[PDB]
Each structure stands twice: as structure tokens, then as C-alpha cells.
Design a protein around this nucleic acid. Structure first.
Ligand SMILES: [Zn+2]
Ligand SMILES: [Zn+2]
Lengths: 530, 530
DNA sequence: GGT
DNA sequence: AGCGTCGAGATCC
DNA sequence: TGGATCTCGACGCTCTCCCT
DNA sequence: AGCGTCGAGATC
DNA sequence: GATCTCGACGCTCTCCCT
């Protein structure tokens, strides 16, 4: 677990290695962890690498495949993912191919031939797992190649699928223990961007390995600027704001906007189009043509902006994305990190801006009602939006359990650039008033949505639901909203779901921690600007 | 502990005794039945672990008749549901089910009877996607719960909730929604197979606390257990089977289990040619064929079914008098569940298993991609090699149960034997085999098990013999048993090879062999005295 | 098809 | 089901 | 007996991520 | 590929 | 007169929806 120990260049192979980097791949130096990994593989050992998408993983196997003689075998879960790499490879003059569930009796026959063939130019073969489990023909081929010593290294992609917990399970993966058992003299390397330590140590068993190196890279992206803003109440106003940025500071530049639904995705698109902006829509119910065309024009810069759901994500590698804007919040902290992380892959400065709105809490809540920890992960994301003083990088590192040193931000988030001071406001009596309202409602046999509770507080809405003697304070509507959100994640209040013919809806009720207000000396405070 | 729950002095006890004798036509309770029913009527949560045929379903079916209105049942397979409706119908009790393939007329009537205030309906079966994906179905349960027409829930195959379940079905991960939305109903979980790990997992997922756990014993006092030598010649094997079936079993129903689909059909043809009434069963017949066979066997128009593991689920014939194993099972858990289909009426019945050398290697190759396949096979081989321990004692070592050793009462073959024993020294035979294997590798040749026994015995191809070795004077079946011994103790080992149409086993020198370098090392095996 |  | 709009009538200054 | 503002039914429109 | 059968061709 | 050794020639090639 110590990479630095492996940070030299006095190994025999060091020469051809430096040679191949600059001459074949056209590069000057190494990004982090790359060198320490390559050394370990050339020393003939076993290693796992954990690093974020776009960090430089594939080079770690693609390169040593060129220092020995003959091919390297690569196992990959999806067809699209394989095609991406062959293209890059083809563009540098390197022969490699892939077999698959849908190849031709001719192609299939040509690969079988090139493996045994001791004079072939092949360097890399990509396959799927069912290929290892369900093909005696293919396995008998590997056997012969291994015995002539045409094949000495193996790489496994998405290695977190071995173990049950990985949250992506693919059964075919459990079979892969057969690799070290039948070819013990070859070295193995596993790759992934997402792994608990329990999950890793498990798969080391499934693959029948011992012993094992484990290198881990850091989450941090020094060139990205992080900001949260208030979402405007009126849709026509919100669309204007976004236009001022696109024709303003980002004019001429490429970006992405992320939405909540398929319908939101289309309606935003129509609106930018109607004001001369060059934009296109992307989601899972579109024809495969539409998808492929939109993705093509964006890469060629004939299109400035893609407006998308989470469907637009897997396998994106464009270097010059200058902005990423969030039209609604994400459903969890892990999802936001991976979505925003698509900006600035060229290492140059880029911006990440998120719009926060009260009504989105409840839209996402109902959508995730059957996930066992759905509501918990949502409330974590809500906490991050409510905060007006801690560094954004500090709040993220609490989620990933990295060891953060406080002042490494350098004025690259919104809270670190603020000039203000703060104080804690006492809001205990507001909580006692809301509970009066809820309590009257139940005697009357009525249920309240969030909208109806804010209305009664403010003295508006249907009259029977008001309570004599309560006075709603003199603040803007957005401040009242932020206060209610506070009581909710602290559990003084709670959600109560109902099932109807076409929808799941949320109501508000008295929560479990409301018993604390029995001490008449108990106090609830929230932070504000002076 | 259940002990505390074994009475009849609670307010319900009367109607309960009433309903057992008058509605279900029964005298007294089988083990654990009473203690479970009490706990459910006391409004609590409980898990029940008990073998198939033990009396589980009665534990929910009955209390469904003491309250008012229906009980909801969740079940993974359509066939399993149909079995139970048939029984309930014959009793005079109303019930129904809902499916992926139901008519719109039927679906309507059901939604109607759930809310309907005077419904005769008593039990309702559904699958787990009805709960996870139907919006209309959930809104129906909601109304029923509020009128108090529905207060108990049972979940079948409860072990599927979990990843370790060895039977996983993903829709199960949505069932936490039941206690969350209906906190006043009681829940009961059912299963025949569970680690204490698997159970604690499912009690989280279902969002429960706290929880009773009752466990029944594996033991079946009426079954007689035996192991016999399988004859080399196949014309000879068919004869003994017939001596039994015309002899002690004449006129009695039984089952015979086979290794392959092809074995299944030959054996059948051989019995028919000698006047036995027999039929074949495996996954590769038409849906129609299957049913017509299962039907004639139940009506006693057919004496014997010859089958693969495909023939198991749904089986409930009370009067199965014999179960014979044509080849061994692949694991101890499989044998237990297969043989356990005999004697469901509590009357005496027989279980006989035929052991053969060549079957070890047939099974080995078939399970090559399961990560613990070879391990589980060698456990089953150990049990066949033993000539002195009680069969019940060897089984209880596998289930981690608390057996006291004289409880068998002369109901297995080893407990009826009259013999005495001694430890034969076989160290020099091991040294000789290794010589043979060592010569073979110099010559660049690989040996199957058949080829090794031949060279030992002085037969086979001549270049593979070793000068100075003398094959003992013993029968072949004894030589086979000795080689099996060195294999599980790991003086030898298996080495697999992949070919165009087959996976095959070879034998090679194994690890524990190094120990033959001390001149003080001794290997012994147990035998009967002259 | 949601008193 | 929830919520936005339109109009008639009943309350305010 | 003027001009603004509250209150309440009747009515029509709308109803949620990703192949894992 | 492994294993079984058959008949010419050298040694019991 | 009855057992031994070697090519050549032909046939066969595996459990359940989970
Ligand atoms: Zn900062
Ligand atoms: Zn016994």
C-alpha cells in the first residue's frame, strides 16, 4: 500500500518504457499513480487500481502490452465501451479487436486463427464474461496460446462487479476464478472508479488471488469552481437567467445541462431554441438515430449545449467542456460528484453551478419510495445546499472519508470567496406554531401537503385551516421555505406517503423528535448572515 | 425459547381447537406448529425454519380463519400458488390469486372484493412485482387497511431477500415498503434453508424489530440409509434394480434419480423391456409430455419415475416407499433434499445409494466453473468411503446440529453391521504411483485415471510401465478405493484440459506428497478384519 | 379511474 | 388525487 | 349607494432516472 | 481428444 | 495352441430458472 516506494526509473525495462511513451503515444511525462502501477506489473505482480473516470487508467495496461511479445487479454462488460477504445487505438496504428455475442462465422474463425498463429501482429483482444463461461472452443484456444508463451498478461475492467455489494451486480463475473487456476503464470490487473474496502477484499477471493497491491488516487479536482444558487419561482425568469450566461461569459464555449425528467428535458430545449441558442435533447425514450446524431454534432462543435437526463453519461471523454449546470438537484451526493466531474478534463479552469428549489425535494422523494435508503441519501444532498459557510471541498471529503487539510481550496468555491460574518438565530417558537396547525388539521380529519401548510402559516389559503392567534413573520417566501426544510431533516417534522391511481404523493406530519419540546427550556437555532 | 409458548390458556385457544378438527379434519399438532400459531395470535413477528413437508403452510392458513377478512401472501412462482388453491378449494374455503397473465375482467373483480364490505374472501396470493410496480394494486391495499379488512401478512421463500440467499430474486429488495405503510399488521417469514447470516440480513431489509426465531430438526426417524457398490457391467446393474422392484418393493411406488438426460432415457427403456411400468422426466420434453407423466404416477397407473434433478418441486405424494440413486449427488445438501421425498406419511421407507469410481470424474468436469464445486463434491465422496460411523452422525456434522449418538436405533446400514476393524498401512503404494507419474512427465505424456490403474496392474501400453513395481493381489474395486483416498487427502490432484467438445480430468502429483521425504511418515486406511 |  | 383560473357574492375603508 | 379586496364553488388539465 | 473393437503379425 | 502388442477405423461428447 505504498506507491512512492515504486517511483524511480532504474529497472531494466525503464528504457523501452520511456521510449514507448514519447514515441508511440506522444506524451511527455506521467500523471499521478501511472508510473508506480506500470512498474509493479512489469515486476510480475498482482495489483488493484482505484481512480476516477478520465484519470488515466487504461494506459496502465495498454502500454506494457507493447513491451513483451504477443497479446494481452481484456475483459469488459459492455459492447459500446469496447468500441470506444479500438477507435483510439486504430488512430495510433495499433492492431487489436473484439469478439462478441454478435459476430460472424468468418470473423469468429479469423480470431481463432490469429491466436495460434505465431507470426500475428495482434496486441489486444477484448471479450465479454459469458465468453469465458460458455465457450469450450474459445477456452481451448487460450490453452494453446498460453503453452507457446504468446500470452502472459490479463486485465479485468469494472472489477467491483465480482462482489455482491458493488451495486451493479453481473452474475457472469463469479466464474472468473478460472483464470488464475488455469494460467497461474500470467499476471493480473483490476480496474475501477468505485469501491468500498470490504468490496475489494472480497473480489480478491473470488478471483482466487494472493497476495495483492492496492493503490488509491484522490477525489480532488483543483481546476473546478463550485457554486449553489437560489432557483427562481417563475419558469420564464429562470430561462432568461441561463441565456445571460450562455451569450455572456460562456459565449462560444461547450457545456451540458442536467434535468430531472424526460419532459423537463424537452421543454427546456424548445425554449432555448426559440431564442436562437443552438441546443439539442438527450434521453432514453428517443430513437437510437436521434441519440447518435445529437452526440455527433456536439463533438464537432456544431452544437453548443446538450440538455439531458442521467441517460447521457456512460463513456463521455470530450476534453474542453467549460460549464456544467444543474436545473434540479441530484438524488444523492455520489451522483452529483460524477455528473459535475465531466467538466474540465483538459485541466484548465471550469465551472459547476447548481440551482436549489423547495419543490424539488418532494418530487425526488416520491420517485425513490421503493429504494430502502432512498430518503436517507436525498437528505444528505439537501444538507449541502442549506450550508452558507463551510468550504465545498470540506463537505465532500466528509462523504468519502478522505483526510482533508483545511486550507487547500485556494479560493475556488463560493463559500470560500464570501466576505460576510454570521450568527445563530433562535427559531423555537416557529416550530411550536406549525405543530398547532398540524394538530388542528387532524381533529378536522384533513391532510396537508407542503403547499397548504405554508399557506395557512402566512394567513392565506382555505379559511377553516387557519389557527387563531398565530402570526406569520415578515420574511420573504424563500426564507420560510428554508426554515421548514430545517425542521424536516432534523426530524421535528416528517413525510407521510399516499398511493393513488396515477401518483405517489407526500404529506407533512408531526415527527419523532417533537417530544423534545416538552422541556420548556429546549432551544432550536439556525445559522444566518449578519 | 418455544418451550414457554406450548400451552392452551389464551383467549383464542377455543376457536383454534375448534377450527383444526372441524375445518381441516385433524387430531393434534405436529412439532412447532402450536408454538408458532400462538405467537402470531399474540400479534408478534416470527421466522420459521423447517424442512419441506413439515407442516409450514398451516401456520398462516389457520389464523386467517380466526379473525375477519383476508391475509396477504407473497410467493415467487406461479406453479407453487396453484398447488395450494387446489387444496383450499377441496376444503370449502374461498381464495384466489393475481398474476402477470390475468384477464381484465378478473383483475376488476379482485380490486372489487378487497374493498367490498361483506366479501367471503379469505386469502390472496400475489407475486413480488405486484407490490413493486402496480400503482392501482397498492392504492387498493391502502383502503382495505383503513377499513380493517386486512391485518396479517405472510412471506414465502423469505431467504430470497438476501444476496447470500443462493436463490436471489431482485424484486424482493422492495418489500421493506410493507411494514412502513402498514405498521399495525403482523408479519411471518417461511423457509427450509437458512444460515444465521442470511436471516439477520432479511430482518433488516424487511425493516423489522424485534423478532422470534424457531428452528425444527433435520431428523427423519422412519427412513433407512444404505450405500452399495455399483457393478462394472451395465447389463448386471439393471438386474439388481429389478430384483428389488419385483422382490421386496412389488406393488409399491418409488423414484430413481440419474446424472444426465441421456441416462434417464436408457434406464427407462431397459426396465420396460422386462415388464416394469416406468416413465422418463427431464427439462427437455414438451410441457404436455411432462404433465401427462406426473399425472399417471399420482394415480398409480405408473410404478416408477426415472428422473434428473428437474423432477422435485411441487411433489407431495404421501406414500413413496423407495428412492434409489443411480449415480451419486453433487453435494451433501442435494442428497438430503432428494432422498427426503420418501416416507412423507411417517411410515417406514428406504433410501439406497450406488457408488462408482468413474462418477467422481464425470461430476468434477461438469462443475468446473463453480468456485466451490470441487470442494462440495469431495465431501460427498468422504461419506461413501466410510464403513463404520452412523449415517445420522455424519450428516449432523454438516448441518452443525447437536446430535446424541445412540438415537439412530438400528436404522442405517453401518449401525446393523456385525464386524470389527483395523488400520492397514498403505505408504509404499503411494511411493509406487508417484514413480509412474514421474516417468510419464519425462516422456511428455499425460495420464487419465483409467491409464494409471492400467500401468499399476501391469497392463496397458507398454512404454508407460515401470520396472520393479508389482501390482498387488487384490480386486480392482479395492485399488479404486485406495486411489480415491490419496486424492481427497491431497497426495494426488486433478488437472483439467479444454477441448473442442469436452472438459477432461488428468491426474498429477499433489502437495501433501513432499512429506514422503521423512522416513518416519505413514499413511493408513480403515478395513474389515478377516 | 384517485370518497 | 392536487392545483390554477374564472366569476359571483360578501366583506372591508 | 363607490371602489377595492376576500372567499369559495365549479370546472378543466395533469400525473416521475438509469440496463443493473 | 478418449476408449473400444478387430485382425495381422511376433513371441508364449 | 493360446496368450501379447500394435495401427487403423469408428463412435461419442454432461443439472435445474436463478
Ligand atoms: Zn472552498
Ligand atoms: Zn445409524
Amino acid at each position: 500500500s505504498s506507491p512512492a516506494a515504486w517511483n524511480k526509473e532504474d529497472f531494466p525495462w525503464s528504457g523501452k518504457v520511456k521510449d514507448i511513451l514519447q514515441n508511440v503515444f506522444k506524451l511527455e511525462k506521467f500523471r499521478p499513480l501511472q508510473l508506480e502501477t506500470i512498474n509493479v506489473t512489469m515486476a510480475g505482480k498482482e495489483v488493484f487500481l482505484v481512480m476516477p473516470t478520465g484519470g488515466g487508467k487504461s494506459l496502465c495496461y495498454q502500454l506494457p502490452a507493447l513491451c513483451s511479445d504477443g497479446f494481452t487479454l481484456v475483459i469488459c462488460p459492455l459492447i459500446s465501451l469496447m468500441e470506444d477504445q479500438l477507435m483510439v487505438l486504430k488512430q495510433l496504428g495499433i492492431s487489436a479487436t473484439m469478439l462478441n455475442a454478435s459476430s460472424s462465422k468468418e470473423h469468429v474463425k479469423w480470431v481463432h486463427a490469429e491466436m495460434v498463429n505465431k507470426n500475428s501482429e495482434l496486441k489486444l483482444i477484448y471479450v465479454t464474461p459469458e465468453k469465458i463461461a460458455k465457450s469450450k472452443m474459445f477456452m481451448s484456444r487460450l490453452e494453446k496460446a498460453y503453452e507457446a508463451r504468446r500470452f502472459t498478461r490479463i486485465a479485468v475492467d469494472e472489477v467491483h462487479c465480482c462482489s455482491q455489494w458493488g451495486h451493479d451486480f453481473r452474475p457472469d463475473y463469479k466464474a472468473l476464478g478460472i483464470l488464475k487456476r488455469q494460467f497461474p503464470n500470467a499476471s493480473l490487473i483490476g480496474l475501477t472508479a468505485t469501491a468500498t474496502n470490504h468490496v475489494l477484499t472480497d473480489a480478491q477471493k473470488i478471483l482466487c488471488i494472493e497476495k495483492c497491491f492496492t493503490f488509491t488516487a484522490s477525489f480532488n479536482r483543483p481546476n473546478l469552481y463550485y457554486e449553489v444558487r437560489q432557483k427562481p419561482s417563475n419558469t420564464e425568469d429562470f430561462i432568461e437567467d441561463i441565456v445571460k450566461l450562455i451569450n455572456g461569459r460562456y459565449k462560444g464555449q461547450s457545456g451540458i445541462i442536467y434535468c430531472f425528467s424526460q419532459k423537463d428535458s424537452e421543454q427546456v430545449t424548445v425554449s432555448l431554441q426559440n431564442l436562437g441558442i443552438h441546443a439539442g435533447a438527450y434521453h432514453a425514450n428517443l430513437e437510437p438515430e436521434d441519440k447518435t446524431t445529437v452526440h455527433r454534432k456536439w463533438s464537432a462543435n456544431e452544437i453548443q449545449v446538450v440538455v439531458a437526463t442521467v441517460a447521457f453519461g456512460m463513456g463521455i471523454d470530450k476534453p474542453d467542456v467549460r460549464f456544467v449546470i444543474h436545473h434540479s438537484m441530484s438524488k444523492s451526493m455520489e451522483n452529483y460528484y460524477q455528473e459535475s466531474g465531466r467538466a474540465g478534463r483538459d485541466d484548465m479552469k471550469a465551472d459547476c453551478i447548481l440551482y436549489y428549489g423547495f419543490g424539488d425535494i418532494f418530487r425526488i422523494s416520491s420517485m425513490v419510495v421503493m429504494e430502502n435508503v432512498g430518503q436517507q441519501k436525498l437528505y444528505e444532498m439537501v444538507s449541502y445546499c442549506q450550508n452558507i459557510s463551510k468550504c465545498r471541498r470540506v463537505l465532500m471529503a466528509q462523504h468519502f472519508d478522505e483526510v482533508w487539510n483545511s486550507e487547500a481550496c485556494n479560493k475556488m468555491c463560493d463559500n470560500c470567496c464570501k466576505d460576510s460574518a454570521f450568527e445563530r438565530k433562535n427559531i423555537t417558537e416557529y416550530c411550536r406554531d406549525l405543530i398547532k396547525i398540524l394538530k388542528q388539521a387532524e381533529e378536522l380529519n384533513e391532510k396537508l401537503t407542503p403547499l397548504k401548510l405554508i399557506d395557512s402559516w402566512m394567513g392565506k389559503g382555505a379559511a377553516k385551516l387557519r389557527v387563531a392567534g398565530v402570526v406569520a413573520p415578515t420574511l420573504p417566501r424563500e426564507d420560510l421555505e428554508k426554515i421548514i426544510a430545517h425542521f424536516l431533516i432534523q426530524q421535528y417534522l416528517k413525510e407521510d406517503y399516499s398511493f393513488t391511481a396515477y401518483a405517489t404523493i407526500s404529506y407533512l406530519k408531526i415527527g419523532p423528535k417533537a417530544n423534545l419540546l416538552n422541556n420548556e427550556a429546549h432551544a432550536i437555532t439556525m445559522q444566518v448572515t449578519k
